[PDB]
Amino acid sequence: VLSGALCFRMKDSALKVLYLHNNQLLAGGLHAEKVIKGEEISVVPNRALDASLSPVILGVQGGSQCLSCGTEKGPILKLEPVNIMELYLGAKESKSFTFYRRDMGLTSSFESAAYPGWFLCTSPEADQPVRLTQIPEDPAWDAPITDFYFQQCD
């Protein structure tokens, strides 16, 4: 087993780096990038789910908090005060804390395992929270961005 979670750096396809502010993950513009450092994203595979779907659990602050979609009838992206290693080692499904990664080459998309059809996304605007969205039939320049550069820290 991992002695610590994997370390990744994330930014959307528009190169907006994800950072933390007031307990929320935001995607910053070039200006924000000069003030705050991108957040090191903790990552662990969710071994309770189908490996062919690339299930992962994402966390922040050294893995002290993890991204969750909640358990309501509708998805709500929020950081929860649970250590990613607790989820990693626990014999518990933890589906609401899981995303299915779709590797498209240079970038990846992340679909909520608990809420099919909902994907992690960023706004075309800078410094807005990362959220969840369903994919529109027709693309647009002002539509949410669901593709991310998912790179392991050096």
From Swiss-Prot:
The keyword Ion transport does not apply. Disulfide bonds join 7-153. PROSITE patterns: INTERLEUKIN_1 (PS00253). It comes from the Eukaryota. Disruption phenotype: In combination with transgenic IL36A exacerbates skin abnormalities (acanthosis, hyperkeratosis, presence of a mixed inflammatory cell infiltrate and increased cytokine and chemokine expression). GO terms for biological process: antifungal humoral response; inflammatory response; innate immune response; negative regulation of cytokine-mediated signaling pathway; negative regulation of interleukin-17 production; negative regulation of interleukin-6 production; negative regulation of type II interferon production. Bioactive (processed) recombinant IL36RN inhibits effects of IL-36 when used in 100- 1000-fold molar excess. This is Interleukin-36 receptor antagonist protein. It comes from Mus musculus (Mouse). The gene is Il36rn.
